[PDB]
Amino acid sequence: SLFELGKMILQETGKNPAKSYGAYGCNCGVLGRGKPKDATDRCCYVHKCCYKKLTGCNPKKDRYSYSWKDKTIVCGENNPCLKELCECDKAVAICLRENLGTYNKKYRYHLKPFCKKADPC
Amino acid sequence: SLFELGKMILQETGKNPAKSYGAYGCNCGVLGRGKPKDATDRCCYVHKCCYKKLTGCNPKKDRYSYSWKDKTIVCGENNPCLKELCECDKAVAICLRENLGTYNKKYRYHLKPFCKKADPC
Numbered sequence A, B: 001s002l003f004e005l006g007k008m009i010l011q012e013t014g015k016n017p018a019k020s021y022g023a024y025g026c027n028c029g030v031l032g033r034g035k036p037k038d039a040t041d042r043c044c045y046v047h048k049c050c051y052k053k054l055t056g057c058n059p060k061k062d063r064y065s066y067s068w069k070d071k072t073i074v075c076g077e078n079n080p081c082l083k084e085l086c087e088c089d090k091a092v093a094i095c096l097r098e099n100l101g102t103y104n105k106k107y108r109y110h111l112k113p114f115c116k117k118a119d120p121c
């Protein structure tokens, strides 16, 4: 769920996940994908393609267990959907951290009509 | 869909919808409902209760047609769900404009633990 995803992003990036990634570029935040604006945005693009592959669970509401061991996100699920969902969320948290260096606040609150159509996943 | 909702909010309030309302108080944003902090937050509370009684369509993803006639949102659907959905979104956009006078930036990125449980819809 968003609770786990938000905590992962905080633990990896150190940033308030709502402030930094709740509305960034064409892919970080609500409703759909668009052609990514930069590497941070592309992380959220991959994350949304990751969610589309899920079958049998709801990525927004379904909770799962993970732990923070050796400063690493360690998913703690056997259920295939919950396990894949947790790895989707872990991957975007890591990707956002890796690309913090090119984060540009000018892409915060980017408007949808200014995004081109995204490619199929 | 959130596309139409965002456009209505922009047309009514003139404000960037994600900036002002993507994470405000306990109810504006993607964290469920909570006891509203002020009138703007109450608009979003009412909006989410409105979404909860929709049957037959997906409020986040289902796109619909409306018109901007004499600076009024005019819902242009007669399918019952899309019509109701359009009316939910129109009402929150108008409500948010009507309560700009007490909008308080201090409620941006309000932390969920400070929210109290919402009353039943």
Ligand SMILES: O=C(/C=C/c1ccc(O)c(O)c1)O[C@@H](C(=O)O)[C@@H](OC(=O)/C=C/c1ccc(O)c(O)c1)C(=O)O
Residues within 6 Å of the ligand: A111, A112, A113, A114, B002, B003, B004, B005, B006, B007, B010, B017, B018
């Ligand atoms: O539909 C929209 C906007 C939707 C939307 C917005 C914010 C949100 O947060 C959201 O969720 C949705 O805009 C589209 C529409 O008006 O029909 C359409 O606008 C235009 O073409 C405007 C062109 C133009 C304007 C000013 C000028 O000076 C000029 O020369 C040209 C387009 O941009 O594609």
